[PDB]
Amino acid sequence: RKLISATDIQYSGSLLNSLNEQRGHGLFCDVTVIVEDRKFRAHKNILSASSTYFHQLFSVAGQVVELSFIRAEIFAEILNYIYSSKIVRVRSDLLDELIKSGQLLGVKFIAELG
Amino acid sequence: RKLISATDIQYSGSLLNSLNEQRGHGLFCDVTVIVEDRKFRAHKNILSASSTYFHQLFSVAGQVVELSFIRAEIFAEILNYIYSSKIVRVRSDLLDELIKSGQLLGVKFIAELG
């Protein structure tokens, strides 16, 4: 008569990495985000969960969203984070800009790097 | 002239928890799994990433999958893990059974509790 609990310390990382690979190939991706003229394919369940702006958007029909006021390479970073929990070796000047796009999109961790 | 990296230690947990809540309400869920006569709503991107059996299934059309040889309450646990990275206070006798369903579904961490 006993209870067992187990935690998979590596789960989160492998999941996220599989999910990031999925979006690299468009696997299971149900939305396309267009920034400047670059198109990012992605998963609504992930963006909704992690972004208050996308949370708002995806409570209604929509397969395409067009964003302004944010550069493609900056948005690329927001996604990389959304799909890894990390920003990695970002250059110090792009930071202020990155922080702002996090603010616009409601990605708390990016918004609050300052 | 400098590079910045940041890691969000809490990201994985919040993401997973938001995702688990989503499936509790069927939000963004694109598959239904029927075990015994219980129906579980879920996300293909998550199950594909985490289960080799579902990975196989979801490379083709299909909105419903019917499983046999696995009890509902046992499958419920596999999902809870898939959506938390943890099994929590599982009773010791159900374990052997849980391990087997992990084997059938190809959920490495569950398969390898022995």
PDB file of all heavy atoms in Angstrom, chain A residues 1-2 4-6 8 11-12 22 45 50 81-82 85-87 89-92, chain B residues 1-2 4-6 8 11-12 22 45 50 81-82 85-87 89-90 92:
ATOM      1  N   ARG A   1       0.812  -1.223   0.000  1.00  0.00           N
ATOM      2  CA  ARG A   1       0.000   0.000   0.000  1.00  0.00           C
ATOM      3  C   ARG A   1       0.858   1.292   0.000  1.00  0.00           C
ATOM      4  O   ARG A   1       1.325   1.749   1.051  1.00  0.00           O
ATOM      5  CB  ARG A   1      -0.979  -0.032   1.186  1.00  0.00           C
ATOM      6  CG  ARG A   1      -2.089   1.019   1.186  1.00  0.00           C
ATOM      7  CD  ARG A   1      -3.018   0.837   0.013  1.00  0.00           C
ATOM      8  NE  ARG A   1      -2.305   1.036  -1.246  1.00  0.00           N
ATOM      9  CZ  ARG A   1      -2.485   0.299  -2.339  1.00  0.00           C
ATOM     10  NH1 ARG A   1      -3.369  -0.697  -2.337  1.00  0.00           N
ATOM     11  NH2 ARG A   1      -1.783   0.558  -3.439  1.00  0.00           N
ATOM     12  N   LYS A   2       1.068   1.868  -1.185  1.00  0.00           N
ATOM     13  CA  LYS A   2       1.912   3.045  -1.317  1.00  0.00           C
ATOM     14  C   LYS A   2       1.573   3.902  -2.532  1.00  0.00           C
ATOM     15  O   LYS A   2       1.039   3.400  -3.517  1.00  0.00           O
ATOM     16  CB  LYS A   2       3.385   2.632  -1.384  1.00  0.00           C
ATOM     17  CG  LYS A   2       3.851   2.092  -2.730  1.00  0.00           C
ATOM     18  CD  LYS A   2       5.328   1.677  -2.695  1.00  0.00           C
ATOM     19  CE  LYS A   2       5.595   0.482  -3.625  1.00  0.00           C
ATOM     20  NZ  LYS A   2       6.814  -0.307  -3.280  1.00  0.00           N
ATOM     21  N   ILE A   4       3.061   6.433  -5.572  1.00  0.00           N
ATOM     22  CA  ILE A   4       4.243   6.788  -6.328  1.00  0.00           C
ATOM     23  C   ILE A   4       4.046   8.062  -7.128  1.00  0.00           C
ATOM     24  O   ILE A   4       3.032   8.236  -7.790  1.00  0.00           O
ATOM     25  CB  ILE A   4       4.599   5.668  -7.292  1.00  0.00           C
ATOM     26  CG1 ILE A   4       4.787   4.383  -6.509  1.00  0.00           C
ATOM     27  CG2 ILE A   4       5.887   5.986  -8.004  1.00  0.00           C
ATOM     28  CD1 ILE A   4       5.823   4.556  -5.417  1.00  0.00           C
ATOM     29  N   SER A   5       5.017   8.959  -7.063  1.00  0.00           N
ATOM     30  CA  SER A   5       5.021  10.134  -7.930  1.00  0.00           C
ATOM     31  C   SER A   5       6.340  10.146  -8.658  1.00  0.00           C
ATOM     32  O   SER A   5       7.373   9.802  -8.087  1.00  0.00           O
ATOM     33  CB  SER A   5       4.863  11.427  -7.133  1.00  0.00           C
ATOM     34  OG  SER A   5       3.693  11.387  -6.341  1.00  0.00           O
ATOM     35  N   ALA A   6       6.303  10.520  -9.929  1.00  0.00           N
ATOM     36  CA  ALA A   6       7.524  10.677 -10.690  1.00  0.00           C
ATOM     37  C   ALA A   6       7.447  11.957 -11.497  1.00  0.00           C
ATOM     38  O   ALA A   6       6.385  12.320 -11.999  1.00  0.00           O
ATOM     39  CB  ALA A   6       7.743   9.488 -11.600  1.00  0.00           C
ATOM     40  N   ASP A   8       9.376  13.969 -14.758  1.00  0.00           N
ATOM     41  CA  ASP A   8      10.317  13.889 -15.865  1.00  0.00           C
ATOM     42  C   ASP A   8      10.959  15.261 -16.060  1.00  0.00           C
ATOM     43  O   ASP A   8      10.411  16.135 -16.725  1.00  0.00           O
ATOM     44  CB  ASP A   8       9.614  13.388 -17.138  1.00  0.00           C
ATOM     45  CG  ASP A   8      10.564  13.220 -18.334  1.00  0.00           C
ATOM     46  OD1 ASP A   8      11.800  13.298 -18.172  1.00  0.00           O
ATOM     47  OD2 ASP A   8      10.063  12.992 -19.456  1.00  0.00           O
ATOM     48  N   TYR A  11      11.245  16.544 -19.593  1.00  0.00           N
ATOM     49  CA  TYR A  11      10.060  16.523 -20.441  1.00  0.00           C
ATOM     50  C   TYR A  11       9.867  17.821 -21.203  1.00  0.00           C
ATOM     51  O   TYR A  11       9.821  17.838 -22.433  1.00  0.00           O
ATOM     52  CB  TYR A  11       8.810  16.229 -19.627  1.00  0.00           C
ATOM     53  CG  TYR A  11       7.590  16.106 -20.483  1.00  0.00           C
ATOM     54  CD1 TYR A  11       7.442  15.030 -21.339  1.00  0.00           C
ATOM     55  CD2 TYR A  11       6.587  17.062 -20.447  1.00  0.00           C
ATOM     56  CE1 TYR A  11       6.323  14.901 -22.141  1.00  0.00           C
ATOM     57  CE2 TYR A  11       5.456  16.943 -21.247  1.00  0.00           C
ATOM     58  CZ  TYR A  11       5.329  15.856 -22.091  1.00  0.00           C
ATOM     59  OH  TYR A  11       4.222  15.702 -22.885  1.00  0.00           O
ATOM     60  N   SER A  12       9.754  18.904 -20.453  1.00  0.00           N
ATOM     61  CA  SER A  12       9.535  20.235 -21.009  1.00  0.00           C
ATOM     62  C   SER A  12      10.453  20.579 -22.190  1.00  0.00           C
ATOM     63  O   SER A  12       9.987  21.008 -23.243  1.00  0.00           O
ATOM     64  CB  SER A  12       9.678  21.260 -19.892  1.00  0.00           C
ATOM     65  OG  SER A  12       8.785  20.950 -18.820  1.00  0.00           O
ATOM     66  N   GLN A  22       8.319  20.780 -35.350  1.00  0.00           N
ATOM     67  CA  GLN A  22       7.033  20.729 -36.030  1.00  0.00           C
ATOM     68  C   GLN A  22       6.781  22.015 -36.811  1.00  0.00           C
ATOM     69  O   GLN A  22       6.372  21.985 -37.972  1.00  0.00           O
ATOM     70  CB  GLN A  22       5.888  20.519 -35.039  1.00  0.00           C
ATOM     71  CG  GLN A  22       5.724  19.110 -34.500  1.00  0.00           C
ATOM     72  CD  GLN A  22       4.657  19.056 -33.426  1.00  0.00           C
ATOM     73  OE1 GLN A  22       4.005  20.063 -33.151  1.00  0.00           O
ATOM     74  NE2 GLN A  22       4.481  17.893 -32.804  1.00  0.00           N
ATOM     75  N   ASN A  45      -2.456  26.878 -30.146  1.00  0.00           N
ATOM     76  CA  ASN A  45      -2.514  26.485 -28.738  1.00  0.00           C
ATOM     77  C   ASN A  45      -1.310  27.002 -27.973  1.00  0.00           C
ATOM     78  O   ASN A  45      -1.427  27.404 -26.814  1.00  0.00           O
ATOM     79  CB  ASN A  45      -2.745  24.959 -28.539  1.00  0.00           C
ATOM     80  CG  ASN A  45      -1.624  24.080 -29.108  1.00  0.00           C
ATOM     81  OD1 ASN A  45      -0.762  24.527 -29.871  1.00  0.00           O
ATOM     82  ND2 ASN A  45      -1.653  22.807 -28.741  1.00  0.00           N
ATOM     83  N   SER A  50       0.775  31.545 -24.428  1.00  0.00           N
ATOM     84  CA  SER A  50       2.002  32.242 -24.088  1.00  0.00           C
ATOM     85  C   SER A  50       1.935  33.726 -24.397  1.00  0.00           C
ATOM     86  O   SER A  50       2.776  34.499 -23.939  1.00  0.00           O
ATOM     87  CB  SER A  50       3.178  31.613 -24.837  1.00  0.00           C
ATOM     88  OG  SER A  50       3.382  30.278 -24.419  1.00  0.00           O
ATOM     89  N   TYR A  81      11.563  32.079 -28.505  1.00  0.00           N
ATOM     90  CA  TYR A  81      11.339  32.015 -27.073  1.00  0.00           C
ATOM     91  C   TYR A  81      10.096  31.206 -26.805  1.00  0.00           C
ATOM     92  O   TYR A  81      10.104  30.237 -26.032  1.00  0.00           O
ATOM     93  CB  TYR A  81      11.175  33.406 -26.457  1.00  0.00           C
ATOM     94  CG  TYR A  81      10.468  33.362 -25.120  1.00  0.00           C
ATOM     95  CD1 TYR A  81      11.160  33.029 -23.959  1.00  0.00           C
ATOM     96  CD2 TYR A  81       9.105  33.635 -25.011  1.00  0.00           C
ATOM     97  CE1 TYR A  81      10.520  32.976 -22.732  1.00  0.00           C
ATOM     98  CE2 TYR A  81       8.456  33.583 -23.784  1.00  0.00           C
ATOM     99  CZ  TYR A  81       9.168  33.250 -22.648  1.00  0.00           C
ATOM    100  OH  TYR A  81       8.535  33.185 -21.427  1.00  0.00           O
ATOM    101  N   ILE A  82       9.011  31.606 -27.447  1.00  0.00           N
ATOM    102  CA  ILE A  82       7.767  30.883 -27.268  1.00  0.00           C
ATOM    103  C   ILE A  82       7.982  29.376 -27.440  1.00  0.00           C
ATOM    104  O   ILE A  82       7.332  28.578 -26.783  1.00  0.00           O
ATOM    105  CB  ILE A  82       6.656  31.433 -28.176  1.00  0.00           C
ATOM    106  CG1 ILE A  82       6.107  32.718 -27.559  1.00  0.00           C
ATOM    107  CG2 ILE A  82       5.537  30.423 -28.318  1.00  0.00           C
ATOM    108  CD1 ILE A  82       5.102  33.441 -28.400  1.00  0.00           C
ATOM    109  N   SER A  85      11.643  28.769 -24.431  1.00  0.00           N
ATOM    110  CA  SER A  85      11.748  29.387 -23.108  1.00  0.00           C
ATOM    111  C   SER A  85      13.008  30.237 -22.975  1.00  0.00           C
ATOM    112  O   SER A  85      13.288  30.748 -21.899  1.00  0.00           O
ATOM    113  CB  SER A  85      11.698  28.339 -21.988  1.00  0.00           C
ATOM    114  OG  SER A  85      12.978  27.792 -21.720  1.00  0.00           O
ATOM    115  N   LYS A  86      13.761  30.386 -24.063  1.00  0.00           N
ATOM    116  CA  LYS A  86      15.028  31.122 -24.026  1.00  0.00           C
ATOM    117  C   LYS A  86      15.142  32.120 -25.160  1.00  0.00           C
ATOM    118  O   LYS A  86      14.656  31.865 -26.256  1.00  0.00           O
ATOM    119  CB  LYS A  86      16.227  30.178 -24.160  1.00  0.00           C
ATOM    120  CG  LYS A  86      16.249  28.968 -23.296  1.00  0.00           C
ATOM    121  CD  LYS A  86      17.339  28.046 -23.825  1.00  0.00           C
ATOM    122  CE  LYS A  86      17.648  26.916 -22.853  1.00  0.00           C
ATOM    123  NZ  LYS A  86      18.836  26.110 -23.282  1.00  0.00           N
ATOM    124  N   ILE A  87      15.792  33.247 -24.894  1.00  0.00           N
ATOM    125  CA  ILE A  87      16.358  34.043 -25.959  1.00  0.00           C
ATOM    126  C   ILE A  87      17.860  33.797 -25.832  1.00  0.00           C
ATOM    127  O   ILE A  87      18.394  33.720 -24.723  1.00  0.00           O
ATOM    128  CB  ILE A  87      16.009  35.541 -25.854  1.00  0.00           C
ATOM    129  CG1 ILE A  87      16.657  36.175 -24.632  1.00  0.00           C
ATOM    130  CG2 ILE A  87      14.511  35.743 -25.803  1.00  0.00           C
ATOM    131  CD1 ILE A  87      16.453  37.663 -24.551  1.00  0.00           C
ATOM    132  N   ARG A  89      21.797  34.679 -27.018  1.00  0.00           N
ATOM    133  CA  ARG A  89      22.781  35.558 -27.638  1.00  0.00           C
ATOM    134  C   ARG A  89      22.177  36.625 -28.529  1.00  0.00           C
ATOM    135  O   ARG A  89      22.635  36.865 -29.638  1.00  0.00           O
ATOM    136  CB  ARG A  89      23.805  34.756 -28.438  1.00  0.00           C
ATOM    137  CG  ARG A  89      24.804  33.977 -27.604  1.00  0.00           C
ATOM    138  CD  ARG A  89      25.941  33.469 -28.481  1.00  0.00           C
ATOM    139  NE  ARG A  89      25.463  32.523 -29.491  1.00  0.00           N
ATOM    140  CZ  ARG A  89      25.371  32.769 -30.803  1.00  0.00           C
ATOM    141  NH1 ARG A  89      25.736  33.945 -31.314  1.00  0.00           N
ATOM    142  NH2 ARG A  89      24.909  31.822 -31.616  1.00  0.00           N
ATOM    143  N   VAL A  90      21.139  37.260 -28.024  1.00  0.00           N
ATOM    144  CA  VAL A  90      20.570  38.444 -28.641  1.00  0.00           C
ATOM    145  C   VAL A  90      21.512  39.635 -28.479  1.00  0.00           C
ATOM    146  O   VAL A  90      22.058  39.848 -27.402  1.00  0.00           O
ATOM    147  CB  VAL A  90      19.242  38.774 -27.949  1.00  0.00           C
ATOM    148  CG1 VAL A  90      18.621  40.016 -28.530  1.00  0.00           C
ATOM    149  CG2 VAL A  90      18.311  37.604 -28.061  1.00  0.00           C
ATOM    150  N   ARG A  91      21.701  40.422 -29.536  1.00  0.00           N
ATOM    151  CA  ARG A  91      22.598  41.574 -29.437  1.00  0.00           C
ATOM    152  C   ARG A  91      21.974  42.760 -28.683  1.00  0.00           C
ATOM    153  O   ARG A  91      20.801  43.073 -28.851  1.00  0.00           O
ATOM    154  CB  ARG A  91      23.243  41.952 -30.792  1.00  0.00           C
ATOM    155  CG  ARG A  91      22.316  42.278 -31.943  1.00  0.00           C
ATOM    156  CD  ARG A  91      23.084  42.427 -33.276  1.00  0.00           C
ATOM    157  NE  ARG A  91      23.957  43.604 -33.330  1.00  0.00           N
ATOM    158  CZ  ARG A  91      23.660  44.744 -33.955  1.00  0.00           C
ATOM    159  NH1 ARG A  91      22.502  44.879 -34.592  1.00  0.00           N
ATOM    160  NH2 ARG A  91      24.525  45.754 -33.949  1.00  0.00           N
ATOM    161  N   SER A  92      22.779  43.395 -27.835  1.00  0.00           N
ATOM    162  CA  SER A  92      22.288  44.315 -26.809  1.00  0.00           C
ATOM    163  C   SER A  92      21.425  45.480 -27.296  1.00  0.00           C
ATOM    164  O   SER A  92      20.610  45.999 -26.542  1.00  0.00           O
ATOM    165  CB  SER A  92      23.455  44.851 -25.972  1.00  0.00           C
ATOM    166  OG  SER A  92      24.433  45.492 -26.784  1.00  0.00           O
TER     167      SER A  92
ATOM    168  N   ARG B   1      28.694  46.791 -27.103  1.00  0.00           N
ATOM    169  CA  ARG B   1      28.775  45.551 -27.885  1.00  0.00           C
ATOM    170  C   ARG B   1      28.745  44.278 -26.999  1.00  0.00           C
ATOM    171  O   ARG B   1      29.772  43.856 -26.452  1.00  0.00           O
ATOM    172  CB  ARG B   1      30.024  45.590 -28.782  1.00  0.00           C
ATOM    173  CG  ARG B   1      30.122  44.515 -29.865  1.00  0.00           C
ATOM    174  CD  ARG B   1      29.011  44.650 -30.875  1.00  0.00           C
ATOM    175  NE  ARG B   1      27.711  44.437 -30.243  1.00  0.00           N
ATOM    176  CZ  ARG B   1      26.617  45.145 -30.514  1.00  0.00           C
ATOM    177  NH1 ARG B   1      26.658  46.121 -31.419  1.00  0.00           N
ATOM    178  NH2 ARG B   1      25.477  44.875 -29.881  1.00  0.00           N
ATOM    179  N   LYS B   2      27.562  43.680 -26.856  1.00  0.00           N
ATOM    180  CA  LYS B   2      27.397  42.519 -25.996  1.00  0.00           C
ATOM    181  C   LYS B   2      26.228  41.627 -26.396  1.00  0.00           C
ATOM    182  O   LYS B   2      25.271  42.094 -27.006  1.00  0.00           O
ATOM    183  CB  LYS B   2      27.223  42.962 -24.540  1.00  0.00           C
ATOM    184  CG  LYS B   2      25.836  43.480 -24.178  1.00  0.00           C
ATOM    185  CD  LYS B   2      25.762  43.928 -22.713  1.00  0.00           C
ATOM    186  CE  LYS B   2      24.791  45.106 -22.536  1.00  0.00           C
ATOM    187  NZ  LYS B   2      25.036  45.930 -21.315  1.00  0.00           N
ATOM    188  N   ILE B   4      23.150  39.058 -25.057  1.00  0.00           N
ATOM    189  CA  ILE B   4      22.323  38.711 -23.921  1.00  0.00           C
ATOM    190  C   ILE B   4      21.565  37.416 -24.142  1.00  0.00           C
ATOM    191  O   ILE B   4      20.978  37.204 -25.193  1.00  0.00           O
ATOM    192  CB  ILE B   4      21.313  39.817 -23.656  1.00  0.00           C
ATOM    193  CG1 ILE B   4      22.053  41.124 -23.446  1.00  0.00           C
ATOM    194  CG2 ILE B   4      20.522  39.511 -22.411  1.00  0.00           C
ATOM    195  CD1 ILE B   4      23.076  40.998 -22.335  1.00  0.00           C
ATOM    196  N   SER B   5      21.584  36.541 -23.148  1.00  0.00           N
ATOM    197  CA  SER B   5      20.744  35.347 -23.175  1.00  0.00           C
ATOM    198  C   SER B   5      19.929  35.347 -21.908  1.00  0.00           C
ATOM    199  O   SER B   5      20.422  35.726 -20.847  1.00  0.00           O
ATOM    200  CB  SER B   5      21.578  34.070 -23.248  1.00  0.00           C
ATOM    201  OG  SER B   5      22.446  34.102 -24.363  1.00  0.00           O
ATOM    202  N   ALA B   6      18.673  34.943 -22.021  1.00  0.00           N
ATOM    203  CA  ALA B   6      17.833  34.795 -20.851  1.00  0.00           C
ATOM    204  C   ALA B   6      17.062  33.495 -20.953  1.00  0.00           C
ATOM    205  O   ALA B   6      16.641  33.098 -22.037  1.00  0.00           O
ATOM    206  CB  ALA B   6      16.885  35.967 -20.721  1.00  0.00           C
ATOM    207  N   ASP B   8      13.722  31.450 -19.201  1.00  0.00           N
ATOM    208  CA  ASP B   8      12.552  31.525 -18.338  1.00  0.00           C
ATOM    209  C   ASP B   8      12.344  30.163 -17.679  1.00  0.00           C
ATOM    210  O   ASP B   8      11.737  29.262 -18.250  1.00  0.00           O
ATOM    211  CB  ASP B   8      11.319  31.982 -19.136  1.00  0.00           C
ATOM    212  CG  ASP B   8      10.058  32.142 -18.273  1.00  0.00           C
ATOM    213  OD1 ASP B   8      10.138  32.095 -17.027  1.00  0.00           O
ATOM    214  OD2 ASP B   8       8.968  32.333 -18.854  1.00  0.00           O
ATOM    215  N   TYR B  11       8.829  28.805 -17.602  1.00  0.00           N
ATOM    216  CA  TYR B  11       8.063  28.781 -18.841  1.00  0.00           C
ATOM    217  C   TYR B  11       7.343  27.462 -19.055  1.00  0.00           C
ATOM    218  O   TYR B  11       6.121  27.415 -19.183  1.00  0.00           O
ATOM    219  CB  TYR B  11       8.953  29.066 -20.040  1.00  0.00           C
ATOM    220  CG  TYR B  11       8.179  29.143 -21.317  1.00  0.00           C
ATOM    221  CD1 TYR B  11       7.312  30.196 -21.548  1.00  0.00           C
ATOM    222  CD2 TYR B  11       8.303  28.167 -22.293  1.00  0.00           C
ATOM    223  CE1 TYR B  11       6.585  30.282 -22.720  1.00  0.00           C
ATOM    224  CE2 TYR B  11       7.579  28.243 -23.478  1.00  0.00           C
ATOM    225  CZ  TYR B  11       6.723  29.307 -23.686  1.00  0.00           C
ATOM    226  OH  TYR B  11       6.002  29.419 -24.848  1.00  0.00           O
ATOM    227  N   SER B  12       8.122  26.394 -19.092  1.00  0.00           N
ATOM    228  CA  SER B  12       7.612  25.046 -19.317  1.00  0.00           C
ATOM    229  C   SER B  12       6.378  24.695 -18.473  1.00  0.00           C
ATOM    230  O   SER B  12       5.369  24.232 -18.999  1.00  0.00           O
ATOM    231  CB  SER B  12       8.739  24.050 -19.076  1.00  0.00           C
ATOM    232  OG  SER B  12       9.861  24.366 -19.901  1.00  0.00           O
ATOM    233  N   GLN B  22      -6.599  24.143 -21.480  1.00  0.00           N
ATOM    234  CA  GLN B  22      -7.191  24.150 -22.811  1.00  0.00           C
ATOM    235  C   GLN B  22      -7.926  22.841 -23.084  1.00  0.00           C
ATOM    236  O   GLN B  22      -9.057  22.836 -23.571  1.00  0.00           O
ATOM    237  CB  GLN B  22      -6.130  24.359 -23.891  1.00  0.00           C
ATOM    238  CG  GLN B  22      -5.611  25.776 -24.051  1.00  0.00           C
ATOM    239  CD  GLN B  22      -4.469  25.832 -25.044  1.00  0.00           C
ATOM    240  OE1 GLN B  22      -4.129  24.818 -25.653  1.00  0.00           O
ATOM    241  NE2 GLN B  22      -3.862  27.005 -25.205  1.00  0.00           N
ATOM    242  N   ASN B  45      -0.547  17.935 -31.737  1.00  0.00           N
ATOM    243  CA  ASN B  45       0.854  18.360 -31.710  1.00  0.00           C
ATOM    244  C   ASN B  45       1.546  17.887 -30.445  1.00  0.00           C
ATOM    245  O   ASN B  45       2.718  17.509 -30.475  1.00  0.00           O
ATOM    246  CB  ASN B  45       1.034  19.885 -31.963  1.00  0.00           C
ATOM    247  CG  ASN B  45       0.371  20.774 -30.902  1.00  0.00           C
ATOM    248  OD1 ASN B  45      -0.438  20.329 -30.084  1.00  0.00           O
ATOM    249  ND2 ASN B  45       0.712  22.054 -30.936  1.00  0.00           N
ATOM    250  N   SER B  50       5.039  13.474 -28.022  1.00  0.00           N
ATOM    251  CA  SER B  50       5.310  12.811 -26.760  1.00  0.00           C
ATOM    252  C   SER B  50       5.038  11.319 -26.813  1.00  0.00           C
ATOM    253  O   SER B  50       5.455  10.575 -25.925  1.00  0.00           O
ATOM    254  CB  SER B  50       4.470  13.448 -25.652  1.00  0.00           C
ATOM    255  OG  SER B  50       4.844  14.796 -25.451  1.00  0.00           O
ATOM    256  N   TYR B  81       0.253  13.079 -17.523  1.00  0.00           N
ATOM    257  CA  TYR B  81       1.696  13.171 -17.652  1.00  0.00           C
ATOM    258  C   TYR B  81       2.030  13.959 -18.893  1.00  0.00           C
ATOM    259  O   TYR B  81       2.779  14.945 -18.855  1.00  0.00           O
ATOM    260  CB  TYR B  81       2.351  11.791 -17.742  1.00  0.00           C
ATOM    261  CG  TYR B  81       3.732  11.851 -18.359  1.00  0.00           C
ATOM    262  CD1 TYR B  81       4.836  12.226 -17.599  1.00  0.00           C
ATOM    263  CD2 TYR B  81       3.939  11.551 -19.705  1.00  0.00           C
ATOM    264  CE1 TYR B  81       6.102  12.293 -18.155  1.00  0.00           C
ATOM    265  CE2 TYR B  81       5.205  11.617 -20.271  1.00  0.00           C
ATOM    266  CZ  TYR B  81       6.283  11.992 -19.492  1.00  0.00           C
ATOM    267  OH  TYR B  81       7.543  12.072 -20.043  1.00  0.00           O
ATOM    268  N   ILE B  82       1.472  13.521 -20.009  1.00  0.00           N
ATOM    269  CA  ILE B  82       1.719  14.221 -21.255  1.00  0.00           C
ATOM    270  C   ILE B  82       1.500  15.728 -21.086  1.00  0.00           C
ATOM    271  O   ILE B  82       2.182  16.527 -21.709  1.00  0.00           O
ATOM    272  CB  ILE B  82       0.900  13.626 -22.411  1.00  0.00           C
ATOM    273  CG1 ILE B  82       1.580  12.344 -22.888  1.00  0.00           C
ATOM    274  CG2 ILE B  82       0.812  14.608 -23.560  1.00  0.00           C
ATOM    275  CD1 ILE B  82       0.825  11.580 -23.930  1.00  0.00           C
ATOM    276  N   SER B  85       4.240  16.483 -17.247  1.00  0.00           N
ATOM    277  CA  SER B  85       5.566  15.898 -17.039  1.00  0.00           C
ATOM    278  C   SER B  85       5.632  15.079 -15.753  1.00  0.00           C
ATOM    279  O   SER B  85       6.697  14.600 -15.390  1.00  0.00           O
ATOM    280  CB  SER B  85       6.664  16.971 -17.037  1.00  0.00           C
ATOM    281  OG  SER B  85       6.833  17.551 -15.755  1.00  0.00           O
ATOM    282  N   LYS B  86       4.498  14.921 -15.072  1.00  0.00           N
ATOM    283  CA  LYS B  86       4.466  14.214 -13.789  1.00  0.00           C
ATOM    284  C   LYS B  86       3.349  13.192 -13.728  1.00  0.00           C
ATOM    285  O   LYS B  86       2.283  13.412 -14.293  1.00  0.00           O
ATOM    286  CB  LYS B  86       4.231  15.180 -12.623  1.00  0.00           C
ATOM    287  CG  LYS B  86       5.065  16.410 -12.572  1.00  0.00           C
ATOM    288  CD  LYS B  86       4.443  17.343 -11.541  1.00  0.00           C
ATOM    289  CE  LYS B  86       5.368  18.501 -11.193  1.00  0.00           C
ATOM    290  NZ  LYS B  86       4.842  19.323 -10.057  1.00  0.00           N
ATOM    291  N   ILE B  87       3.594  12.087 -13.035  1.00  0.00           N
ATOM    292  CA  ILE B  87       2.511  11.278 -12.524  1.00  0.00           C
ATOM    293  C   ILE B  87       2.531  11.560 -11.024  1.00  0.00           C
ATOM    294  O   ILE B  87       3.600  11.674 -10.418  1.00  0.00           O
ATOM    295  CB  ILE B  87       2.672   9.776 -12.830  1.00  0.00           C
ATOM    296  CG1 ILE B  87       3.860   9.185 -12.087  1.00  0.00           C
ATOM    297  CG2 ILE B  87       2.829   9.543 -14.316  1.00  0.00           C
ATOM    298  CD1 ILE B  87       3.987   7.694 -12.251  1.00  0.00           C
ATOM    299  N   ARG B  89       1.100  10.735  -7.156  1.00  0.00           N
ATOM    300  CA  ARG B  89       0.434   9.864  -6.195  1.00  0.00           C
ATOM    301  C   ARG B  89      -0.391   8.764  -6.833  1.00  0.00           C
ATOM    302  O   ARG B  89      -1.522   8.509  -6.445  1.00  0.00           O
ATOM    303  CB  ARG B  89      -0.451  10.669  -5.246  1.00  0.00           C
ATOM    304  CG  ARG B  89       0.298  11.489  -4.212  1.00  0.00           C
ATOM    305  CD  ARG B  89      -0.666  12.001  -3.148  1.00  0.00           C
ATOM    306  NE  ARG B  89      -1.661  12.913  -3.715  1.00  0.00           N
ATOM    307  CZ  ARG B  89      -2.959  12.635  -3.889  1.00  0.00           C
ATOM    308  NH1 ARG B  89      -3.467  11.455  -3.531  1.00  0.00           N
ATOM    309  NH2 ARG B  89      -3.759  13.553  -4.426  1.00  0.00           N
ATOM    310  N   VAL B  90       0.197   8.118  -7.820  1.00  0.00           N
ATOM    311  CA  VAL B  90      -0.354   6.908  -8.401  1.00  0.00           C
ATOM    312  C   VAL B  90      -0.231   5.742  -7.423  1.00  0.00           C
ATOM    313  O   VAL B  90       0.812   5.566  -6.801  1.00  0.00           O
ATOM    314  CB  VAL B  90       0.433   6.566  -9.672  1.00  0.00           C
ATOM    315  CG1 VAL B  90      -0.077   5.298 -10.301  1.00  0.00           C
ATOM    316  CG2 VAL B  90       0.359   7.713 -10.635  1.00  0.00           C
ATOM    317  N   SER B  92       0.407   2.027  -6.030  1.00  0.00           N
ATOM    318  CA  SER B  92       1.484   1.120  -6.429  1.00  0.00           C
ATOM    319  C   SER B  92       1.082  -0.074  -7.295  1.00  0.00           C
ATOM    320  O   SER B  92       1.900  -0.593  -8.046  1.00  0.00           O
ATOM    321  CB  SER B  92       2.252   0.629  -5.196  1.00  0.00           C
ATOM    322  OG  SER B  92       1.389  -0.009  -4.260  1.00  0.00           O
TER     323      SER B  92
END
